[PDB]
């Protein structure tokens, strides 16, 4: 019956592919062909924060559009004031192998993880002054690659042992566990209403989970290599992935298929980060070629570059009001564009 | 009115960060690799995600990193150890896959100028086995006498023939685990590597 079940799975995959392809009557580029282009958009460096000493692996924006948190492999995590370049906090870590960081929406907690398979929570509003460790979650057998807050009580983490879990910072116990991927899960993104999230595994696929039920709903397979970044459209109806095949793609949740592909002949290096614009017209991507290419999301064409980095770009982000964009790199430098 | 105090606090924490970095710049880092049950435990004990061991020998603060617990693809986390001073390799004579691991490690993109220290252990067991069984089973192509010294030289030459970059050197020493001379070998190799790196940095090399 094993061969029969394999044949049934193959025929189900064929049916799914036929159904997905039967709904593609037209193309996005055809419909957005009669729209004036955005033109040239050159951005100039305004500020430059230089506090770290090693490669920067993650960054995040506060909900106030003023405070930012940076995590570097020197064993430290700082909190920046972007309007003044002043430093507010400096938290020493226990394990120097850090690969992720997060900022609570309320502004009271931060999170950190890495090669130690343990995710930490820090309290920033202590009565006695300094910052103390509030929790230490440990349930993963593989390196943790991403962690994103839901509220002040719960957090969702993605690990390298092909599993995703939803925790509870009050007790430190796994409420739910998501399984099904084949390789390492290296990316995560949460919906605007924080009821759904997507992840990108290393077996060249991406799935759409849901927090309440702990199940999977759809899978999008259209890439050629591993997936290292993911982000959500501001309307929460689409998400754009960035792989190591030097191509970024746009997937539609309702259409259950890809819509447009952003690539060019010259680009060879893979993509390490991806981010959208607040109104959804631009799409900035970070490249291993030390540059950042600003794309016109509705026309699949370039609109400018962001030069000024001496090494690979590791992280990029846009504020909540869309007034600024910040990038980090392996040379221990962060720049604020405008 | 009160932003000057915030500026003072920022300057103070920046100074503390600089002092911490200056203090931490002095350490020497060594990566530790090898196959499963290859005797790495014997060497680390002779003096869950990752295990770190530190000890001091002649005013030098070593740090050994063990990554044997990471049962994942090595291409996803190998860039974190790009700045290691050297790589220690252990090989069990009394036993193919080690050749593939050595080939993969030596020709990595991030390790094009990193020296490798090779340790050959279980020499006594290899001698007893060669007194009992020949060396032609493990190497069907090897031709010549069935002596211990010739077999050891052939194995070392086979291991060394996997390096192509002229800018890196491989140090080889034969161990029997009934000794405490590993620290001196590591010290000498590290001193030579440090001298070479210092000379290359200044521009006379």
């Amino acid at each position, epitope marked *: 019956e094993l061969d029969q079940l394999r044949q049934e799975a193959e025929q189900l995959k064929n049916q799914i592919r036929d159904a997905r392809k039967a709904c593609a009557d037209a193309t996005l580029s055809q419909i957005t062909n009669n729209i004036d282009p955005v033109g040239r958009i050159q951005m100039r460096t305004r500020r430059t924060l230089r506090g770290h000493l090693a490669k920067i692996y993650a960054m995040h924006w506060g909900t106030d559009s003023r405070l930012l948190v940076s995590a570097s492999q020197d064993g430290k995590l700082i909190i920046w004031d972007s309007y003044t370049t002043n430093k507010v906090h400096a938290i020493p870590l226990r394990s120097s192998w850090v690969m992720t960081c997060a900022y609570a929406p309320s502004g009271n907690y931060v999170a950190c993880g890495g090669l130690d398979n343990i995710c930490s929570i820090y309290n920033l509003k202590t009565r006695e*002054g300094n910052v103390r460790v509030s929790r230490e979650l440990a349930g993963h057998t593989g390196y943790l690659s991403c962690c994103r807050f839901l509220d002040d009580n719960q957090i969702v983490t993605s690990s390298g042992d092909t599993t995703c879990a939803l925790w509870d910072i009050e007790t430190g116990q796994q409420t739910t566990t998501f399984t099904g991927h084949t390789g390492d899960v290296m990316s995560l993104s949460l919906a605007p209403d924080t009821r759904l999230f997507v992840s990108g595994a290393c077996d060249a696929s991406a799935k759409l989970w849901d927090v309440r039920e702990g199940m999977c709903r759809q899978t999008f397979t259209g890439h050629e290599s591993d997936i290292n970044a993911i982000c959500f459209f501001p309307n929460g109806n689409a998400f754009a992935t960035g792989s190591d095949d030097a191509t970024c793609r746009l997937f539609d949740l309702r259409a259950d298929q890809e819509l447009m592909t952003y690539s060019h002949d010259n680009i060879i290096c893979g993509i390490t980060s991806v981010s959208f614009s607040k109104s959804g017209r631009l799409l900035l991507a970070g490249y291993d070629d030390f540059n950042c290419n600003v794309w016109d999301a509705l026309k699949a064409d370039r609109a400018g570059v962001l030069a000024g980095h001496d090494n690979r770009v590791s992280c990029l982000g846009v504020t909540d009001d869309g007034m600024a964009v910040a990038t980090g790199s392996w040379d221990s430098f962060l720049k604020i564009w405008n | 009115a*009160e932003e000057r105090a915030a500026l003072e606090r920022s300057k103070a924490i920046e100074k503390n960060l600089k002092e911490d970095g200056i203090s931490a710049a002095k350490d020497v880092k060594l990566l530790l690799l090898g196959a499963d049950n290859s005797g790495k435990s014997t060497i680390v004990k002779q003096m869950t995600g990752i295990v770190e061991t530190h000890f001091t020998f002649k005013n030098l603060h070593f740090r050994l990193f063990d990554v044997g617990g990471q049962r994942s693809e090595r291409k996803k986390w190998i860039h974190c150890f790009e700045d290691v001073t050297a790589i220690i390799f252990c090989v069990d004579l009394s036993d193919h896959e080690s050749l593939m691991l050595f080939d993969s490690i030596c020709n990595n993109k991030f390790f094009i100028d990193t020296s490798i220290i090779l340790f050959l252990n279980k020499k006594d067991l290899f001698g007893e086995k060669i007194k009992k069984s020949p060396l032609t089973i493990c190497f069907p192509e090897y031709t010549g006498p069935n002596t211990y010294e010739d077999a050891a030289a052939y194995i070392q030459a086979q291991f060394e023939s996997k390096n192509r970059s002229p800018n890196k050197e491989i140090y080889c020493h034969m161990t029997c685990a009934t000794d405490t001379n590993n620290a001196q070998v590591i010290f000498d190799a590290v001193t030579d590597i440090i001298i070479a790196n210092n000379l290359r940095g200044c521009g006379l090399y």
Partner: single-chain antibody
Amino acid sequence: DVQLVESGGGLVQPGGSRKLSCSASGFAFSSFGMHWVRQAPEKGLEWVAYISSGSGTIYYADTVKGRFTISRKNTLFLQMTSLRSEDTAMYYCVRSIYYYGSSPFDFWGQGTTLTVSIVMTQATSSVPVTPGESVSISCRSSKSLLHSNGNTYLYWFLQRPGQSPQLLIYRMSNLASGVPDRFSGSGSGTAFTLTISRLEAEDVGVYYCMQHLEYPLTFGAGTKLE
């Protein structure tokens, strides 16, 4: 539990000297700034001295410069010399931390009774009030309290009878930690007011208002809601 104990006061003849101490525990003493606030037995509060975090910067009042000295183990000192008859007042120990989003003047001390042998105006000095009603107190300022960055510095304190003052509203709009939701504050430039909703028997005392723009810190006369 955060504690700040001070002692060392007593009867002194004129022309003498005395040493005051402020022992602190329960918090990171090395990352805070310390103040000194006195209150005459029949008058309002008055600023005395300030020492920054790390002894970097020190400030003194107008009528104590050259005669007092502030130093900071986990203990703070205050050396006073040439004690005249106008220094008879209890001295409090006040902590404050300064960074983006901090709340200075958080926790006050207990005070030591020492016995010796911008013009910010609060027009109203006494109001008649009964439980269950709503009361409001207002105090003005001689100079505008809005800086270029958009921040206004008005603080409101409450001193229950026989107790120490506790911070209620900082920067004219922000409610402190632990304060009930009844209190609220508003103002514009030079005229400020505070509102109390559903007054009970646990909110009876005297109120003070204070600025934090010019470091010669100045309080108000004070209003007693009896």
